[PDB]
Structure formats: structure tokens, C-alpha cells
Design a protein around this ligand. Structure first.
Ligand SMILES: Cc1ncc(C[n+]2csc(CCOP(=O)(O)OP(=O)(O)O)c2C)c(N)n1
Ligand SMILES: Cc1ncc(C[n+]2csc(CCOP(=O)(O)OP(=O)(O)O)c2C)c(N)n1
Ligand SMILES: [Mg+2]
Ligand SMILES: [Mg+2]
Lengths: 530, 540
């Protein structure tokens, strides 16, 4: 009793709750896409373009419980349009199953080299498979999907059209893909734990610092237990924001070196012990595949198991003399709305489980100062920093949220400029009735973050003004609402509006801001960049 | 008296009449972009995204008299977004000067410390590269890369570190123009080619000329016209070469597409005892002039470049024609007249637009029904045809229209730039209409064929499959949403409306940016695409 390899692929996605598939059809993937419809619960997004599909997949993966998403593109024209999306997924460790339909000409570089596109993707892929052999095809799909999950990174699967309809035992699906990690080397683990507990013993002012890899490698429960057991002040990076429940009274804010609110700079940098969890690269750093303790590297000591074993005894290794350290902590209605006011005030509007997406620009710098609710999912592409990403990701994040909980809201802060690069993916949001979605657009008449560092008045920092609020109706939103916010009063009213808080329609809000207005932290970097 | 290397770069573009520069600013190109403004006549497009910038550059290059365009992007996030644009430019031989601003010689990195990773990826879709380091050779390298782009009519990758932008250089360097000229052909090889070709023209009863796109890229259109004049042989183009030959020429027999040709064309070409092919991109009595070499039957003559070869052939080719040869009759356009109130069709549209075109029209057709349709349409004298037949990346046409329109603005305000894009393809690159509105591209006509999704795909596989659906857009709202200063929109549903649109005297004048939505049945297609669809099912 048999299934097509094509169907096998989508069945594996369904098993890992990857129930939305991003990308676009083309000459060499049509036979494969036919198979999504054979798998109960699965939908093809039908993206507005490939780059946006890739951005969507990235957004989806950051909400998907297993941290996975799937892309299907066509040979050459499809894959190369997604290049920058996969690069960013690699950069920030996002588990993308990037499948490309390839031939058994047209969409060629004029030569006869059919691997040229596969070779380009090796630099931004954890692993590849240009699948040929029918006998190993199922195993290879499984192997690639495992690597994506384990290393939390993109993988390239080239599937020739001829191998889509090749028959395979249905029984293969009865054995789940092996997602488990090898156990840590016992002696290396023991040494790490012994040494870490020893330094916690001798510390007077220890702090916990959580970065993004703590999220990717599923250590958020472990991190919460570590805060519980030690009662140490805890902080995140901007890339790691939402790793820690910011409701926790021990949470001290977001560490950004010299760009931190001075209280954060002092609390972190005055510490005699830093317990770093999942840094992206007297200090302890737990990483995915090793542990650093000062200038010593312990190769192979994986962070999840190490933390789990640490938590069994960590409380009783705390200095007996240690006291839980204290942690860091009004305009007119018709005053124009400011960056400073907006990022403070949005804290009051967020709710448990909000997906909160911030584009590179004033938005990403601003949201740092904002306070997230319990079980917030933060998305900010701080490392790769490709503008446009946030709008594509919002599409994927919204479709993932739809599959988890209809009550779960997905909130975007994009600039006017970044919106332009990836605007057509709002189409896809409207196609799938993403009534969970809030598109906040900051209109400051161009590229304000760039104006601050270089070329304040230069024409390259200009953008064509758009009637942005006409976008949702142009893309035929079935049920939608639009608002323009110019004042503190309008913003306050919007954030206490009971109807607006309910995710029952797709919304866009345009917030009018001065050309050169910026959050305090970005004003600081601008001044020291000079 | 000295200039920055940054300014030098833009001065060289000005000298090659590349007066528009496409792409977007980023962390590692701001100091460089400052220099565009120091070079009188030059403008920064400020594109809506990098892929579209790349598509625009491609469109610009296909109108620019030297066949060149310039891109500026930022390290990582900028360049990788343009990858598919540069691949297509490489595929179809378009001369893109793809410059990328890079860090000084840990943000927009793959997390490692490998700063060449993006340069190495672009080598596969670049004729040549320069990751410029040395101040002493920097000017020379820019020059070398720009020459290769022109000579090989292909993209070139220039990585310019931020620190080298403001490095001073003699102004006098600009007094030595970049050498664009080709080495003369080896005289003996050329003589052998010409002697052999003239010998086979002597012995031929029914010879034909077939012109492909490389005849355009390597500036042989005058030579091709003289060859038609001198031989009076029937001449045809490929779809990729359409507009290489003036379709007004009475010796022009139409567009050869193998089995997908109107049967008259199939017979006229395939009955020939001699094919004089000019600039093929790649019966048995065949001569192919290529950029690099000449093929005569089973023999390759390496190094015999096509322009000079043709020029030397034209001096004596007329006197090698059989004296008894009678100019062969050419395919006549075979009549199809529906009623005013009949719904508009693909067949009617592609016949009827022939009557609306005018001397010098830039006519751009997207992959889909449009590209297949425009083949059957008749172009005017000095038409510039743009159809990405080889690479075939949907979205391209809308980006290219932006670049084609800005190039047209620099040549002649009266020169119209006309786009046929599908409803589906439009979605992929829609935001570049913004750039058209920003620069008052009042030369631009955006024809959108609304057939409720991906019709060319529906024809080959998955007629009713959900992947061939697209979200319906209120497409005609696009120009006002992007704040077109002066614009006009029309929806065409009927033969009557289309006829009226094409005799409308105001609409013909390029004094405003226009979009026309043409409503067509889901499965309507031009005859030639209906043919390929049916035999693509035979090959499956
Ligand atoms: C793909 C890409 N192209 C270019 C850049 C460079 N870049 C960084 S910020 C920015 C402008 C962002 O402007 P906007 O989104 O309006 O934000 P704000 O004005 O609020 O700062 C640009 C062009 C980039 N990061 N990614
Ligand atoms: C970048 C890219 N993605 C996908 C494709 C595959 N593709 C080829 S034609 C087509 C549909 C185009 O439909 P439309 O523009 O509506 O034209 P129609 O045939 O309906 O007139 C698609 C998706 C491609 N060639 N390039
Ligand atoms: Mg802005
Ligand atoms: Mg269509």
C-alpha cells in the first residue's frame, strides 16, 4: 500500500504541524503541488512573489511550535528570487525546508550546467540533497528535514519532476522523523555543571542574559526555571527579546551594550558573573553545541540537557549571602504623536500571546524600549537586517497564528519605506482572511534611520508617498478597518477602543511622525556614529 | 585637479550615456550615492525594491544606445535581492554594471567572518568581477569591468569598499575614454568565412535570413538591413529577436518559432535550401554568424566576430546572388472582424494592436499569454521589442518597463513605452509602478490582461488547481495609490471598447501615465500558445 514521494513530502510537513507551504508554482513543480491537496489540513499560500514567500516562511517558522516552515519554488527563476530570504534564515538560524522543483533550454544561463543554482545555495544552506536515486529519496527528505530542525537553519532539496510520482511505502510515515539530539558526553557535562555551580557559589551580583539561540533550541522553559530557582536579575538581547516573560518581576530589560538605558548598562556590566544562554557570537555561555566558561571552550556540551541538569541543583549552589538584586524600572491630547510616546504607550495595548514584529528602522530600535506581555513572540531581523522582511514575515506569522488559536493577534511595526519593498504580500493576508493581523505603518516621509546616520536631506532617502490605507481595499480585504493617528489623543483612544483590540478583521493603522523623530536609543547611536 | 573614485565611477556612466542609476541605498553605499548628484544630468531612480531595480536596469540597457545600465546595491541584503535579475541579464546577454557597496578593506553577515561569500555566488552570473582593494588600480578595474559588460553584453560585479569611495584620483583620467572597440578579426579566417558563405549563396535556389537577439546586442541591425537590401532574400526573426528587423520591410516574412509558427512561416523557413542565421543564441545548409565565431555547416571558425564579418560580406554579397534568382514571395498576414459588443479575445487583441503602434514604440511583453500573443502582432519601424523568452521570469516586464521608460525620457519625450503584463505577473513586481509615478513617466502604457489567474499554466497543467489562482486586485487603483500626478485608466471588455481606445486621439499622446485592464476569458490564449499547450501534453 503506497504513496507518491510528492505526497510523502507533504505528509512529513503535516506530521511536524507545517500545515502552510509558501512559494510559487513554475514549470518544474506543478506535479508536486498537486499533492498538497491530497493531505488533509494542508494549504498552499500562493504567495505574491518568491522573496516574500521566503520572508513568510521565516515568519511562519518563528511561530511554528517545532520552529519549521516549507518553501516550494521552480528551477532558476523561482529559487534565485528567494536567495536573500534563505540567507537571512541562515543568518538568524531559522529552520526553512527550502524545496526546489528541478528538471528530469529555458530558465538556463545559456550553458548546460543544471547544478549552478544548487551550488549558489550551499553557502546559505546547512545541508543539500540534489535527489536522484529513488531508493534513498524518502531517507534524504527525512535527513534534510532533521538537519533544519536540529541546527535550526535552511536546507536545500532539489526534487526532479520525474521523481515526484515515484511510489514509496505508506508504512514509512508510521516511523516519525528522528528529531532527538545525541546525549551530551557525560564527563564534559559533569565538568561544565560542577564549574558553573562553583562560580555561582562565589558570585555576589550575578545576572542572566538570554539571546535568540535560547528560542531556536527550545530552552525557554529551562530559562524560566533558571530565573525561578536563582532569583537572579534576567535581561535579553534585542534579537532575543520575548525569550523572557517581561511580566517577571526579575526581568531588568534589554541589554544593547552602550545603546542600553543607563540603568541596564550598569546592572549588566557591574555583574561579577554573567550566565549567558544562547549568545549568537567572568562569563558562562551556553551555546547549541558547546559551553564557554571564561576562556575555556567545552566542545559538544549541548545547551538544553546541560541547563536541565543544572536546574536540579542550581538553587542550592546560590551564594547563601546573596539577596535578590533590585532591577531597572505626559503629553496633551492634541500634541503630535512622537516615537518616544508611541513605544512607551504600546506596552499598555499588548496582550498575552501577541506576535509582535518590528522592521529594521525606527520600529526595531523603538520596540526594544516597549514592554511585551506574557507569552509574546518577538520577531526583529536584527542580525541580517533586510528591510521588507517584516511585511512578508507578518503573512507567515499570521497564517501560523490561525493554526494555533483564532484569538492570537499578529502585530507589525513597519516603516513607510520598508513596506514598499514587500507590499504585495498583504494580498496573501487578504486571500486567507488574516483577521488576526494589525499593520502599523510609521509614515515619516522616507528612510528616517538612514537620514540620522548619513544624507539627512539626500534624495536617495526619499520615497514616493503612497496612499497606504488604500492598500487593504485594493487587495480586496473581505472585512477590514483603517485609521490614521496624528495625535497622542487619537493613539490613546485607539488603544482603549474595545472593538479594535478584537482580531475580527485585518487592520492597517498609519501613524504620522516627524521626518527626523527617533527613539532615544537610535538618537544615541546616531550621535556616536558621528 | 582631483575627483573621488566614487565620482569617477558615475562620470564613466555619464560618458556612456548611462544617466539613470537603479538600486537602493544601504549601510555600505551612502558615501558612494552622494557622488551621483556631483555629475550633471544623472539621477538616482530610488527603486521600490532591489529585484525590481535589477529588472529596471535590464529594461534600461535594452533601450540605452550602448546597451548598458548601472545598479548600486548594499552588501548582502541588497545584492542577494537582485540575484534573479542579474541571472536573467546574463542569460539573455544584457550589459549590467552591477556595483555593490561592501565593508571597509558583523551586521548583514551569515554569522561567520567570510566577506567574499556574496561575491563568489555572483561569479556564476557575472562575465567578470572586481573585489577592489588596491587604490592604485581601482580606476583601471572599474574601466576593465565596464568594457567587458559592453563587449560581451553581460553583467559584471564590482565590489567597492566604503573606504575607497572618497580616495582622490586625477580628473585627467576621464580624458582617456574607456576603449569599447573590438580587436580586428583574423584576416585569413574572415576571408575563408566570406568566400565559403558567398559560394553557398551562389548555389542556393531558396535562401532565407534568420535574425536572433545577439544581432541586437552586438549592433548589427544596420548590417542586417543592408543584407536584406543587397540579397532581396526573405528575412525572419526569432521571438527573442523580434524588432531586430523592421517589420515594414516588404521582404520580412514574420517570426519563426519552429512548430509554433503560423503554418506559412513554418513552410517558408523550413523549405529553404540555405539559412543565413545572424546572432542565434543556441535542413543542414546553415550559416550562423555569432559574436565570437562563425559556423558554416559542421565547421566552426573560432574568433570571426559577426559585425566586421557582415560589413566585409556586404561589399560583395550582392554579386554572389544567383543572377537567375527571383525574390521569393513572403507569408502575407492571413485575415481573422467580430461585432462591437462581442467580448474581447486574445486573437483579436494581438491582430488589432498592430494598427495602434507608432514609429519608435518600446513594446514590452511579459512571459504568459502576452509574450506568446505579441509574436503575432506587427511592430512599427524602429520598434524596440522586450520579451524575456530565454530566462522567462514573470514580474520582469513591470520592472523593465520602469527602466525602459526612464531611458525613453532621455532619448525623446514623444517615444512611448508600452507594457503587456498578465494579472498574475503584475503582482510579483507591482511596486515599481511607484518609481514610474515618482519620475512622471508620462510615456508609459501599462496594459494588464485580467484572465483571473495564471492562464499559461492552466493550459499545460492544473486548469482548475488552486495554485493557478491569484488574489483579485482592483488593479486600476494602483496609479492613484502611488500618487500619479497626471494619469488615466480604462477597462476594456469588448471589441467596440478596444477599437474606440485605439482610435482615441488623446490616449495616443504620451502626456500622462496610463493603465488599461483588458478582461479576457480564463482559458483564452493565442493560437501559437494553444499549439504548444496541446503538444506539451503529448510530451507528458
Ligand atoms: C533589502 C534592503 N535594502 C536596503 C537596506 C538598507 N536600509 C536599511 S534601513 C532603510 C530604510 C528604512 O526606512 P523605513 O522602513 O521607512 O524606516 P524609518 O523611516 O522608520 O527608519 C534602508 C534602505 C536594507 N536594510 N535592506
Ligand atoms: C519568478 C518566476 N516565478 C514563477 C514562474 C512560473 N510562471 C511562469 S508563467 C506564470 C504565470 C503567469 O500568469 P499571468 O502573468 O497572469 O499571465 P497569463 O498567462 O495569465 O496571461 C508563472 C507563475 C516564473 N516563470 N518566474
Ligand atoms: Mg520611514
Ligand atoms: Mg493571467
Amino acid at each position: 500500500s503506497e504513496i507518491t514521494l510528492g505526497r510523502f513530502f507533504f505528509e512529513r510537513l503535516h506530521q511536524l504541524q507545517v500545515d502552510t507551504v509558501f512559494g510559487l508554482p513554475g514549470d518544474f513543480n506543478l506535479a508536486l503541488l498537486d499533492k498538497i491537496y491530497e493531505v488533509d489540513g494542508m494549504r498552499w499560500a500562493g504567495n505574491a512573489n518568491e522573496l516574500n514567500a521566503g520572508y513568510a516562511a521565516d515568519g511562519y517558522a518563528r511561530v511554528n511550535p517545532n520552529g519549521l516552515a516549507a518553501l516550494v519554488s521552480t528551477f532558476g527563476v523561482g529559487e534565485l528570487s528567494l536567495t536573500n530570504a534563505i540567507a537571512g534564515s541562515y543568518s538568524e538560524h531559522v529552520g526553512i525546508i527550502n524545496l526546489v522543483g528541478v528538471p528530469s533550454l529555458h530558465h538556463t544561463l545559456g550553458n548546460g550546467d543544471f547544478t549552478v543554482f544548487h551550488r549558489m545555495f550551499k553557502n546559505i544552506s546547512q545541508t543539500s540533497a540534489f535527489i536522484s536515486d529513488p531508493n534513498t529519496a524518502a531517507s534524504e527528505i527525512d535527513r534534510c528535514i532533521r538537519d533544519a530542525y536540529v541546527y535550526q537553519r535552511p536546507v536545500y532539496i532539489g526534487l526532479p519532476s520525474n521523481l515526484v510520482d515515484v511510489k514509496v511505502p505508506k508504512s514509512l510515515l508510521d516511523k516519525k522523523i528522528d528529531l532527538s539530539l545525541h546525549p551530551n558526553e557525560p564527563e564534559s557535562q559533569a565538568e561544565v555543571v560542577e564549574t558553573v555551580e562553583k562560580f555561582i557559589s562565589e558570585a555576589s551580583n550575578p545576572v542572566i542574559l538570554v539571546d535568540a539561540c535560547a528560542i531556536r533550541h527550545n530552552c525557554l522553559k529551562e530559562v524560566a526555571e533558571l530565573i525561578a530557582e536563582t532569583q537572579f536579575p534576567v535581561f535579553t538581547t534585542p534579537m532575543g527579546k520575548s525569550s523572557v516573560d517581561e511580566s517577571n518581576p526579575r526581568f531588568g530589560g534589554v541589554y544593547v551594550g552602550s545603546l542600553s538605558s543607563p540603568d541596564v548598562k550598569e546592572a549588566v556590566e557591574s555583574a561579577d558573573l554573567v550566565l549567558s544562554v544562547g549568545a549568537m557570537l567572568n562569563v558562562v555561555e551556553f551555546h547549541s553545541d558547546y559551553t564557554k566558561i571564561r576562556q575555556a571552550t567545552f566542545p559538544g556540551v549541548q545547551m538544553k540537557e546541560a541547563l536541565q541538569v543544572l536546574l536540579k541543583t542550581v538553587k542550592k549552589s546560590v551564594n547563601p549571602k546573596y539577596v535578590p538584586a533590585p532591577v531597572p524600572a505626559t503629553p496633551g491630547n492634541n500634541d503630535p504623536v512622537s516615537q518616544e510616546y508611541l513605544w512607551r504607550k504600546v506596552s499598555d495595548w499588548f496582550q498575552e500571546g501577541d506576535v509582535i514584529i518590528s522592521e529594521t528602522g525606527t520600529s526595531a530600535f523603538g520596540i526594544v524600549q516597549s514592554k511585551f506581555p506574557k507569552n509574546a513572540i518577538g520577531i526583529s531581523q536584527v542580525l541580517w537586517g533586510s528591510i521588507g522582511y517584516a511585511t512578508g514575515a507578518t503573512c507567515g506569522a499570521a497564517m501560523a497564528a490561525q493554526e494555533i488559536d483564532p484569538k492570537k493577534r499578529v502585530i507589525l511595526f513597519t516603516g513607510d519605506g520598508s513596506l514598499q519593498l514587500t507590499v504585495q504580500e498583504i494580498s496573501t493576508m487578504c486571500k486567507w482572511d488574516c483577521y488576526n493581523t494589525y499593520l502599523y505603518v510609521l509614515n515619516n516621509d522616507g528612510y528616517t534611520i538612514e537620514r540620522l546616520i548619513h544624507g539627512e536631506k539626500a534624495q536617495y532617502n526619499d520615497i514616493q508617498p503612497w496612499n497606504n490605507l488604500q492598500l487593504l481595499p485594493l487587495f480586496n480585504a473581505k472585512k477590514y478597518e483603517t485609521k490614521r493617528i496624528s495625535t497622542v489623543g487619537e493613539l490613546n483612544d485607539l488603544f482603549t477602543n474595545k472593538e479594535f483590540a478584537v482580531p475580527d478583521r485585518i487592520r492597517m493603522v498609519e501613524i504620522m511622525l516627524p521626518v527626523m523623530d527617533a527613539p532615544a536609543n537610535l538618537v544615541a547611536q546616531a550621535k556616536q556614529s558621528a
